[PDB]
Amino acid sequence: MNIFEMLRIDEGLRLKIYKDTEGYYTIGIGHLLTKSPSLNAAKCELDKAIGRNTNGVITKDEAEKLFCQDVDAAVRGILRNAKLKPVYDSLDCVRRAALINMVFQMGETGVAGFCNSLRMLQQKRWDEAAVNLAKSRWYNQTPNRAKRVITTFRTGTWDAYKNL
Ligand code: NA
Ligand code: NA
Ligand code: NA
């Protein structure tokens, strides 16, 4: 298991524009196009992201290319963030993937504000951090995904992604 396979499990793969769990136009492996309610706006975002007139449909290779970019943008945003970088730097490779997953889903700004959960992760108080992370809108709105990510932080293993 690795960050690509992990996010592929959590985000799925769809080749036509769809609405994500928040109702926002998305394509591929969780590539958010726009928060605008306009499908036309989403289509402009898509054609711009792919570099051609897509008519709302892409190939698997194109989806994987956006995913390459999006995973790196999650990492780059962690490293540029004064609250997230020290946590990321303190973590092992598996738990780093859990943090990347959170940032991919919710954005740098939101995760960076979880000052108690971040402190507990930095302190390597894994069970405490896991309890604290579950006191979140994130956990309540996407509990199965959050449980997998939280188990990854709690254990430092990929056990929650086995058989998926
Ligand atoms: Na545009
Ligand atoms: Na940043
Ligand atoms: Na603990």
Numbering used by the authors: 1 to 164
Verbatim from the authors:
The disulfide cross-linking was subsequently achieved by soaking copper sulfate as an oxidizing agent directly into the crystal.
After immersing the cross-linked crystals into a precipitant-free solution containing 50 mM phosphate buffer at pH7, 0.2 M NaCl, and 30% (v/v) glycerol, the X-ray diffraction data were collected under a cold nitrogen gas stream at 100 K. The diffraction patterns were indexed in the space group P3221 with cell constants of a = b = 60.0 Å and c = 97.1 Å, where one of the six independent molecules is contained within the asymmetric unit. The unit cell volume was slightly smaller than those of non-treated crystals of TA (a = b = 61.5 Å and c = 95.9 Å) and another TA-T26H mutant (a = b = 61.5 Å and c = 97.7 Å). The structure refinement at 1.10 Å resolution converged to crystallographic R work/R free values of 14.8/16.8%. In the unit cell, one independent molecule forms a trimer unit with two neighboring molecules through intermolecular disulfide bonds, Cys44−Cys115’ and Cys115−Cys44’, respectively. The chemical oxidation time of a week was enough to complete the disulfide formation over all molecules in the crystal. These disulfide bond lengths are estimated as both 2.05 Å based on the electron densities of cysteine sulfur atoms. One trimer is further connected to another trimer through two disulfide bonds, Cys68−Cys93’ and Cys93−Cys68’, with each bond length of 2.03 Å. These bond lengths correspond to the typical disulfide bond length. Although there are no large conformational differences between the structures, the small displacements of main-chain atoms are seen at the residues behind Cys44 and before Cys115, which could be caused by the formation of intermolecular disulfide bonds, Cys44−Cys115’ and Cys115−Cys44’.
